Amino acid sequence: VETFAFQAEIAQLMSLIINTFYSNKEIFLRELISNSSDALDKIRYESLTDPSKLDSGKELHINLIPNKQDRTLTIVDTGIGMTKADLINNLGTIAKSGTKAFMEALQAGADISMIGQFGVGFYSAYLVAEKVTVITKHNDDEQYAWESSAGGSFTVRTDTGEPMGRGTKVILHLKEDQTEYLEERRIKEIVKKHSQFIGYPITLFVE
Numbered sequence: 001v002e003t004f005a006f007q008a009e010i011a012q013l014m015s016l017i018i019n020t021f022y023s024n025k026e027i028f029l030r031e032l033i034s035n036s037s038d039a040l041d042k043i044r045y046e047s048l049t050d051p052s053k054l055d056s057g058k059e060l061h062i063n064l065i066p067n068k069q070d071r072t073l074t075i076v077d078t079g080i081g082m083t084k085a086d087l088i089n090n091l092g093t094i095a096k097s098g099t100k101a102f103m104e105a106l107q108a109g110a111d112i113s114m115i116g117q118f119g120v121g122f123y124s125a126y127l128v129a130e131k132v133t134v135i136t137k138h139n140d141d142e143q144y145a146w147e148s149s150a151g152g153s154f155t156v157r158t159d160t161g162e163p164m165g166r167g168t169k170v171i172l173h174l175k176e177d178q179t180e181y182l183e184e185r186r187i188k189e190i191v192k193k194h195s196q197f198i199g200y201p202i203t204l205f206v207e
């Protein structure tokens with residue numbers, strides 16, 4: 001297991017997300033679904049010129065998997081996935097420069113719900129999760145698990161568990177007081193409210 005320090009700006013963003021009073025937590029789901037949609041767009045585009053890139057799975061979709069026993073909500077996509085380098089590099093995002101822009105917007109009347117406009121929506125996961133585990137498989141690499149409970153560090157290891165094929169799973173280990181996000185009716189409500197027109201099928205798994 002390798003342990004890495006977050007860039008200072010990202011550590012600061014995560015503390016802001018964790019510590020700022022902000023009731024509208026439900027937007028985390030919209031942000032993660034948007035990220036999945038972006039990853040699916042990428043593999044779709046690459047597959048246009050090289051169809052073999054779908055050998056690892058032709059279906060382009062998103063699964064939402066609640067598990068009350070483990071207190072987890074998992075967002076799964078069959079998008080492009082991430083290399084080990086991608087994972088370490090802030091999960092393929094421009095998080096350092098994005099955090100700066102986001103910080104400035106906040107000082108200029110922006111609110112936390114606009115986090116996605118700055119390419120750092122992933123970190124909104126920490127509105128509801130005490131720990132986030134990201135399992136990922138890119139065509140060009142092995143399967144990895146990224147993990148962080150904030151506090152300034154994240155880990156990366158190879159993942160020998162259930163091979164995925166291609167894509168990314170974001171596993172939200174929910175805070176004790178945020179279990180509403182495991183209820184079917186609540187998840188449906190949030191998807192309809194914020195993610196109604198996503199261009200890929202979203203399947204909400206049943207318990």
Ligand SMILES: COc1ccc(CC(=O)c2cc(Cl)c(O)cc2O)cc1
Nearest residue numbers: 035036038039079081091092122168
């Ligand atoms: C904007 O283009 C990108 C496309 C894909 C990625 C990486 C990626 O696969 C991925 C990253 C995050 Cl955090 C996520 O919640 C879901 C994802 O599926 C990163 C950037």
